[PDB]
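Follow-up to my post from last week.
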Amino acid sequence: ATLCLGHHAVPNGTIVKTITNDRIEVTNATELVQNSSIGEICDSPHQILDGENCTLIDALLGDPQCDGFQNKKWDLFVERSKAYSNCYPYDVPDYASLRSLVASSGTLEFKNESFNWTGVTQNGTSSACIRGSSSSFFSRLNWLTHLNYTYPALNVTMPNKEQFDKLYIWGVHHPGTDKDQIFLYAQSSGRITVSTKRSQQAVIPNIGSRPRIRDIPSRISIYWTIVKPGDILLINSTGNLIAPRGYFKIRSGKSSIMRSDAPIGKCKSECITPNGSIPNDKPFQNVNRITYGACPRYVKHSTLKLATGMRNVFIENGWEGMVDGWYGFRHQNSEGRGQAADLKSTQAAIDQINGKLNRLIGKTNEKFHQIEKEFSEVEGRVQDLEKYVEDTKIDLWSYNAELLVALENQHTIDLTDSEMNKLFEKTKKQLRENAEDMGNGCFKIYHKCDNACIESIRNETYDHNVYRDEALNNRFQI
Amino acid sequence: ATLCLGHHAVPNGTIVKTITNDRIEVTNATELVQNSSIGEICDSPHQILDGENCTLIDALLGDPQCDGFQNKKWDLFVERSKAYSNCYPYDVPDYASLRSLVASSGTLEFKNESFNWTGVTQNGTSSACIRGSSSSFFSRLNWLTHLNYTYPALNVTMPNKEQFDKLYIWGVHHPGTDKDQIFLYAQSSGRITVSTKRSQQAVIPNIGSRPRIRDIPSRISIYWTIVKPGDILLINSTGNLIAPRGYFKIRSGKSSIMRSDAPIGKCKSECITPNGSIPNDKPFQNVNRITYGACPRYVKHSTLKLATGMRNVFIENGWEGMVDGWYGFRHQNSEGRGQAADLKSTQAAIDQINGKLNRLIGKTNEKFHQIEKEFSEVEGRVQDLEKYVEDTKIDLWSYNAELLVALENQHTIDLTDSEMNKLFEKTKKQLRENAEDMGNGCFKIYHKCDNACIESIRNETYDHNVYRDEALNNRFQI
Amino acid sequence: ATLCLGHHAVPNGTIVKTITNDRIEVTNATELVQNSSIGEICDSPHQILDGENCTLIDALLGDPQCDGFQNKKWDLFVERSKAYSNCYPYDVPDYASLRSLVASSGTLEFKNESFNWTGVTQNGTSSACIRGSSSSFFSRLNWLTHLNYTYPALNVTMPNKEQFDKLYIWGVHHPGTDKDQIFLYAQSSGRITVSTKRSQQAVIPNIGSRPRIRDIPSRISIYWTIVKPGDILLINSTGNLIAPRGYFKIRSGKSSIMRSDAPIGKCKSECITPNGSIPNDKPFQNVNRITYGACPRYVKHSTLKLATGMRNVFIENGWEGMVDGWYGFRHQNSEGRGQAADLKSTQAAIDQINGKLNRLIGKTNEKFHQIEKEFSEVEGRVQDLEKYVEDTKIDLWSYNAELLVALENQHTIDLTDSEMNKLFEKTKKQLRENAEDMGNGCFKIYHKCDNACIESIRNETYDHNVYRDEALNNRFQI
Ligand SMILES: *[C@@H]1O[C@H](CO)[C@@H](O[C@@H]2O[C@H](CO)[C@@H](O[C@@H]3O[C@H](CO)[C@@H](O)[C@H](O)[C@@H]3O)[C@H](O)[C@H]2NC(C)=O)[C@H](O)[C@H]1NC(C)=O
Ligand SMILES: *[C@@H]1O[C@H](CO)[C@@H](O[C@@H]2O[C@H](CO)[C@@H](O[C@@H]3O[C@H](CO)[C@@H](O)[C@H](O)[C@@H]3O)[C@H](O)[C@H]2NC(C)=O)[C@H](O)[C@H]1NC(C)=O
Ligand SMILES: *[C@@H]1O[C@H](CO)[C@@H](O[C@@H]2O[C@H](CO)[C@@H](O[C@@H]3O[C@H](CO)[C@@H](O)[C@H](O)[C@@H]3O)[C@H](O)[C@H]2NC(C)=O)[C@H](O)[C@H]1NC(C)=O
Ligand SMILES: *[C@@H]1O[C@H](CO)[C@@H](O[C@@H]2O[C@H](CO)[C@@H](O[C@@H]3O[C@H](CO)[C@@H](O)[C@H](O)[C@@H]3O)[C@H](O)[C@H]2NC(C)=O)[C@H](O)[C@H]1NC(C)=O
Ligand SMILES: *[C@@H]1O[C@H](CO)[C@@H](O[C@@H]2O[C@H](CO)[C@@H](O[C@@H]3O[C@H](CO)[C@@H](O)[C@H](O)[C@@H]3O)[C@H](O)[C@H]2NC(C)=O)[C@H](O)[C@H]1NC(C)=O
Ligand SMILES: *[C@@H]1O[C@H](CO)[C@@H](O[C@@H]2O[C@H](CO)[C@@H](O[C@@H]3O[C@H](CO)[C@@H](O)[C@H](O)[C@@H]3O)[C@H](O)[C@H]2NC(C)=O)[C@H](O)[C@H]1NC(C)=O
Ligand SMILES: *[C@@H]1O[C@H](CO)[C@@H](O[C@@H]2O[C@H](CO)[C@@H](O)[C@H](O)[C@H]2NC(C)=O)[C@H](O)[C@H]1NC(C)=O
Ligand SMILES: *[C@@H]1O[C@H](CO)[C@@H](O[C@@H]2O[C@H](CO)[C@@H](O)[C@H](O)[C@H]2NC(C)=O)[C@H](O)[C@H]1NC(C)=O
Ligand SMILES: *[C@@H]1O[C@H](CO)[C@@H](O[C@@H]2O[C@H](CO)[C@@H](O)[C@H](O)[C@H]2NC(C)=O)[C@H](O)[C@H]1NC(C)=O
Ligand SMILES: *[C@@H]1O[C@H](CO)[C@@H](O)[C@H](O)[C@H]1NC(C)=O
Ligand SMILES: *[C@@H]1O[C@H](CO)[C@@H](O)[C@H](O)[C@H]1NC(C)=O
Ligand SMILES: *[C@@H]1O[C@H](CO)[C@@H](O)[C@H](O)[C@H]1NC(C)=O
Ligand SMILES: *[C@@H]1O[C@H](CO)[C@@H](O)[C@H](O)[C@H]1NC(C)=O
Ligand SMILES: *[C@@H]1O[C@H](CO)[C@@H](O)[C@H](O)[C@H]1NC(C)=O
Ligand SMILES: *[C@@H]1O[C@H](CO)[C@@H](O)[C@H](O)[C@H]1NC(C)=O
Ligand SMILES: *[C@@H]1O[C@H](CO)[C@@H](O)[C@H](O)[C@H]1NC(C)=O
Ligand SMILES: *[C@@H]1O[C@H](CO)[C@@H](O)[C@H](O)[C@H]1NC(C)=O
Ligand SMILES: *[C@@H]1O[C@H](CO)[C@@H](O)[C@H](O)[C@H]1NC(C)=O
Ligand SMILES: *[C@@H]1O[C@H](CO)[C@@H](O)[C@H](O)[C@H]1NC(C)=O
Ligand SMILES: *[C@@H]1O[C@H](CO)[C@@H](O)[C@H](O)[C@H]1NC(C)=O
Ligand SMILES: *[C@@H]1O[C@H](CO)[C@@H](O)[C@H](O)[C@H]1NC(C)=O
Ligand SMILES: *[C@@H]1O[C@H](CO)[C@@H](O)[C@H](O)[C@H]1NC(C)=O
Ligand SMILES: *[C@@H]1O[C@H](CO)[C@@H](O)[C@H](O)[C@H]1NC(C)=O
Ligand SMILES: *[C@@H]1O[C@H](CO)[C@@H](O)[C@H](O)[C@H]1NC(C)=O
Ligand SMILES: *[C@@H]1O[C@H](CO)[C@@H](O)[C@H](O)[C@H]1NC(C)=O
Ligand SMILES: *[C@@H]1O[C@H](CO)[C@@H](O)[C@H](O)[C@H]1NC(C)=O
Ligand SMILES: *[C@@H]1O[C@H](CO)[C@@H](O)[C@H](O)[C@H]1NC(C)=O
Ligand SMILES: *[C@@H]1O[C@H](CO)[C@@H](O)[C@H](O)[C@H]1NC(C)=O
Ligand SMILES: *[C@@H]1O[C@H](CO)[C@@H](O)[C@H](O)[C@H]1NC(C)=O
Ligand SMILES: *[C@@H]1O[C@H](CO)[C@@H](O)[C@H](O)[C@H]1NC(C)=O
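User reply:
Got it. Predicted complex:
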């Protein structure tokens, strides 16, 4: 009789890479790179505030078109590419840092304060910002002007007796001409100094014209300061002051701003990237560099294929007809032929493979408030450094992704081939003296074995001592 | 007779991770992460200067409480969290960069210079800083004031004829009111310009009040400049100048500032982290991100366990009673039973393992003057970038730490199992025709072997040709 | 008869490292680190502009010695260490960022514009810059001075109607004394404001002396601005303005500036580093950190050696006399002795090795406009961060380089040893019942085999069934 061992095969397998062969065919594989976003942003679990025609700093400052964004909270704020301001010409030095400061807070919560003013007009206004069909300037700021042709030195103090750091927004007027500096503040000049016990800032208005924006040559410049609990805010001004009306609370938490043109719909996802959510499963993605939340690592690879199967088609060609397992038996006897899979080695191969997959898939990390990655301006050294570090990070993670897959696939191939050899060796021991290894993965059995002993051999209940004499008479002619 | 091969076992082993199994039990393991500091900082080999109630910049500037820190040197300066200033209100633009500049120098060495002054008071003083029970301002600065109701334009030059870069510290007075600007400098204003052949700086005093600190509304602002050898320092001032009295030497070397609350005691260590020294041995640590000197890499893992043993409990269950080696023999003869370890395979397994440990343990790198990692203020973009790069570095090193251990443990397991198989195969050859492999790691010997031939087999001096006929008559009945 | 298997050997092999043994000897190896530059820079394929005695910013500004650099283009600009300026004392705030801005553009293309000036002298000049044996100042700038003892407020506009971002260079005069501020601009002071619809800048001249450079106490300060298409440039000035004469085009592409003292010759190379080109082949280099173009990664290792051979000198000592392959046969018969290599296993070992080499060698990445890595000044926090990230990048790539080689060499050794064992096992099957394994890698053949059957065994055409009876009579005496 003849008892053969072998393994299954697939008529059409797939291609994976390995550290030693570069291109090999395997029976089964799984992709590790998510290369497709939905095209829509999910509104759960993260809270998303959709800034339609409003940058975050316009909502912060107050703008007639952004009146719908007051005391809002978000985990993620979405800034649209179409946003434009619709108010008095605005200029913020280092606004990029202001934008970060109020992005990470997750909030536009604002509390008005009783700043005691006296001999100034406490309601300066402009036709630039139309609200309610009239002139209204910005909503969180107070443009002070002379009152009765005079502007007394304003020395006001607002102590911080609460447990919050307070963010104050204030600015300076740059009227554009001598004519207006006199008309508006009744002075040839002016100075603004703002201080705390920790730091001080000061500005000087700069008189001269600028290209007209919304028909206005003049501009407002915005500055900010933070008052720690126990400290006080002291404002010392002789003119051109656009006063705060109160403060914003500073918070620290899991929030940021993403710039993106995509609809926000009804879905659930833990990973958000500009052009929609990404399934939070495969360990790598190549959709974007900008992410929020729990996401796959970004790599430059287009694909990574991880074998879950075994090499396709000593042991003879894989059996395309094996369907009940991965490794198994085939036999010929005086009673004909048949096959059966070996479930013990099949299961071992499967669990070792699923173990490896479970260790990688679904394991992602959560990140917030990452540095800016894309730019619309040429800035110089800081920007060069930001680009540099981002590129460095990506090459290293791409490197790790490739090496890991190459090692995992090499392991997988060797992992399944050793199961085949263990099955072979085990069978040989059951038949220690009653069979010969024909060199092709089949054993020649020297007793006239029936189907029942084949079954016994397959389940390791075969007794080599009851066929010992028959086999010796057949093989050595004893 | 029967001769069995096997390996030792441990009644209670430990758990390690591998790249293929995640959780397995082994006989021996070693931790790779130092997760415990001493709680005390060592004063050797590194020289540590303990800044009690003094930040480095107060020692630099001069402060009655910091008089004990003059011309000091350090490899590491320790700044205490309780430090506070005890002098005239002080404000340094970009002090964080000044702090780095004089941190890396390792020194407060100072040399006074003969700046030729004329029609000014060359000893301005303040009640804010009490030294010797009187008014003394700061010790390295010279507050110049009017003399005889006049302040002539001070145009002084101090050439650099030495080989050192010279650091000059100087500042500008901001008196707080018009009243004092006249009283103190006899002028309505003032200007300060400082220049070299390489760069120029200028400031303008800003008059107005500030919250009173130590009962003083006025403040001093500090600026610095570096003069290269061959260049000169030119000071051009009309008032409000707080003049340098000389210069500090700039050096470059292996030094920094650490912020920490911990006692400095008597011990020796090459790795210093805020809360005490760390043994410089295990390749990774999870104590802190802030380190100085030769330290283990920081990882986010709590533990990493490296197998030094073999899988615990074909070859039958490991022998808990084996005590003289790792691999060995067990036998039964007509003369009874016994055991002996195989020292050749035992030693091979041990040396391969110790080789791997020696390659990793004790191999650390020395670092100095690293970027700041912790912050007490919200700064904007530079800070965001500093946090970003630190987090990136850590995830990558944590990744490498996990992968390395997973590979090392998988290797170790396969490494020791192959020794067992080599021993088995070798024994089989000694007994090539006189024995059968019973499939359980034991050989059936077909000659009536005594204890002396067992010893011969164990030491590879067995002659298969002298038992050949006895064995053939027993196994094939020839 | 006796048929032995073995492998070749080398009288003098080389040393490689492996993950398990640290130091082993192999027959063949290949270096992975290029540790030697040419000492000369190639002028192809990259276009190189050699700035002899000119920094890029001098060529940009215009300097009598840099008249040969107008409207030039480059992929790489080389700045020489000997460059010095030869013109009016020059000072550029944040010139390092200006230098980056015009470095990445790859060009000095300049177009003059018709700025409509009126009551000013439109040709201010200085003896500091001698061109054509006369006083000529800088070539791209226009020093405006009073004309007829007056300097009317200059409010000029230059709209951007093209598709290019335009770079304008302009500056402010700091005359050094009151005497000159009156002589030159007929005013006690002056102000300059420059603006667009996106941003604004302003400066105030600072009067006072500075160390004389080229006998001049006065200095020029340079500022720049970028005008986007559709915007306009508005210049508002009352004096001290050094006006632009036109604009430079801003481009974005594969270009940078390298600082290096090396001749540029005639060769071809894709990798440029300060001290000459580097062959673009080995995956790692340790020549420099500063690179341009397609280069090997920088590592701190001095050497990395990758085995291409097999372990040198069960299977007996390698055969130094094997010359026709790597694995082979040796035999003794009644007809004498001989040898032949096995080309099937030899070729398999070779292709697997060349596959691995092809996967690594020649695979490099192309980079442009990297951050500065070397410094000649102490700057504070930005510089500290730049150094920090560069060091981090290098340690991680050095780590990867070492681990990769250690794994590749371990693989290679196991890779070639398994071919030897496969050959052994295959031979045993051809001789399944007609031979014994003597335990030293040789088979004892029990039929009186001639040279012709040895050849048959070597080519797998041996019939074990025709010698079966002879062998059984000899080995079991049947
Ligand atoms: C910050 O606010 C305080 C308090 O209002 C200012 O102090 C006061 O400032 C005014 C205006 O400079 C002073 O009035 C002046 O009086 C002199 C003498 O008669 C006169 O010659 C000036 O033309 C002007 O009228 C006033 O004396 C002064 N003192 C107080 C406490 O009333 C302070 O100056 C402000 N700081 C800034 C930013 O300028
Ligand atoms: C400096 O020069 C600029 C550019 O010429 C001046 O800005 C421009 O001034 C003109 C008036 O001379 C403005 O035209 C006016 O526009 C308004 C609508 O905004 C219209 O109602 C008027 O009938 C008239 O057409 C022009 O818009 C304005 N903007 C630009 C940049 O073109 C600027 O005023 C000058 N500054 C001075 C003289 O100090
Ligand atoms: C830097 O120091 C130099 C040298 O002391 C200054 O030059 C001198 O500055 C003074 C004060 O501005 C000048 O005096 C002035 O004279 C004119 C004419 O009589 C008078 O109208 C002014 O009221 C004042 O008294 C002096 O002429 C001038 N020259 C020298 C060499 O003595 C320089 O101005 C200082 N720079 C700064 C920072 O202002
Ligand atoms: C601008 O307003 C602030 C806040 O009111 C003024 O600062 C404060 O001025 C008062 C006096 O009006 C100070 O009170 C005094 O304190 C000293 C001890 O430091 C004590 O000896 C006196 O008897 C009196 O109680 C107060 O300390 C001071 N500090 C703050 C921030 O509360 C500031 O002077 C005003 N600036 C002007 C008028 O220009
Ligand atoms: C930017 O350029 C514009 C246009 O040239 C300047 O506007 C003009 O500036 C001059 C000089 O300040 C003004 O002349 C002045 O007239 C008054 C009143 O007679 C006189 O008291 C002053 O002494 C001076 O002569 C002129 O009126 C003014 N307006 C125009 C459109 O002609 C603008 O001031 C410049 N901005 C800067 C940077 O100062
Ligand atoms: C402030 O002090 C500095 C240093 O003394 C003055 O700079 C120096 O001024 C002297 C003249 O007092 C210059 O000497 C002259 O040099 C020229 C050649 O450059 C020569 O032709 C003259 O015959 C004379 O020897 C000296 O070069 C100059 N430079 C330095 C830094 O030594 C500066 O002028 C003073 N500023 C004032 C008074 O405002
Ligand atoms: C953003 O602003 C633009 C301009 O105001 C809006 O476009 C207008 O939309 C309204 C209807 O809401 C139309 O009546 C106007 O005619 C449109 N003006 C044009 C042609 O620009 C746009 O809808 C706004 N989008 C939001 C709300 O984010
Ligand atoms: C830091 O400064 C504080 C305040 O001066 C010191 O605390 C004082 O210590 C002295 C003894 O040295 C006592 O007499 C005072 O009563 C303490 N004042 C209080 C209650 O704050 C502190 O010892 C200093 N620590 C050092 C030297 O670093
Ligand atoms: C850079 O500039 C220096 C100084 O002008 C040049 O050195 C001079 O070279 C010329 C010949 O071209 C000699 O006649 C002068 O005597 C040299 N002066 C000295 C001694 O410095 C140098 O050749 C220039 N190198 C270039 C062109 O990059
Ligand atoms: C992998 O095998 C499974 C059956 O176990 C099959 O459903 C799946 O489609 C296969 N995947 C590929 C891509 O071959
Ligand atoms: C990647 O793109 C291919 C082709 O569109 C698609 O079949 C595959 O599902 C994508 N991978 C994922 C899951 O993003
Ligand atoms: C703040 O605004 C609310 C608006 O309803 C008003 O009722 C309240 O009086 C204001 N308080 C202050 C401090 O101005
Ligand atoms: C505000 O300031 C004025 C100053 O005259 C004072 O009379 C008043 O009591 C202060 N308090 C108020 C009403 O806010
Ligand atoms: C300005 O107008 C607002 C309208 O809400 C009012 O509350 C505020 O008191 C006014 N301030 C003054 C006194 O001008
Ligand atoms: C989504 O992501 C980016 C844009 O944010 C871009 O590559 C592309 O539009 C989308 N898909 C791919 C290919 O990543
Ligand atoms: C294995 O199969 C044989 C078939 O003859 C049967 O006799 C024996 O009982 C079976 N043993 C097991 C494990 O069920
Ligand atoms: C490892 O084995 C050694 C004996 O060789 C023993 O002293 C040590 O405690 C063991 N370590 C562990 C943690 O099992
Ligand atoms: C880590 O912590 C555990 C529990 O306190 C301790 O047993 C172990 O020794 C620590 N590891 C080291 C050496 O830091
Ligand atoms: C510097 O200080 C020391 C203090 O002992 C003094 O002797 C010396 O004369 C001073 N020199 C200068 C340059 O002022
Ligand atoms: C210092 O300057 C004065 C200016 O009058 C001069 O007389 C003196 O010689 C100079 N030298 C000294 C004493 O430092
Ligand atoms: C200021 O006092 C110090 C005390 O040591 C003295 O050395 C210095 O010469 C004095 N300067 C002048 C002249 O005011
Ligand atoms: C020591 O290090 C840091 C504080 O610097 C902190 O995590 C903890 O207090 C200490 N131990 C640990 C758990 O790292
Ligand atoms: C090995 O042991 C046997 C025991 O009979 C002894 O005769 C022989 O000399 C020993 N050989 C060695 C290597 O000492
Ligand atoms: C490697 O072997 C080749 C022959 O195949 C030889 O030419 C080369 O010099 C060898 N390299 C080394 C360094 O041994
Ligand atoms: C490295 O240096 C050695 C010694 O000069 C040299 O033999 C070797 O070729 C160099 N490697 C390369 C190719 O740069
Ligand atoms: C620019 O310079 C060239 C030099 O040949 C001159 O012909 C042209 O007229 C100039 N154009 C302007 C706009 O000044
Ligand atoms: C330039 O400006 C003057 C201002 O008087 C004007 O007359 C002339 O037409 C303008 N155009 C030219 C010639 O550039
Ligand atoms: C300045 O001189 C240049 C020489 O090319 C000339 O083109 C320009 O028009 C002159 N400008 C004036 C009017 O001063
Ligand atoms: C070339 O590169 C750098 C200088 O840029 C320096 O290390 C050395 O001069 C050269 N060779 C080496 C050893 O890298
Ligand atoms: C192999 O060699 C033998 C030598 O006897 C020869 O008879 C046989 O034909 C050969 N077979 C092949 C593969 O050429």
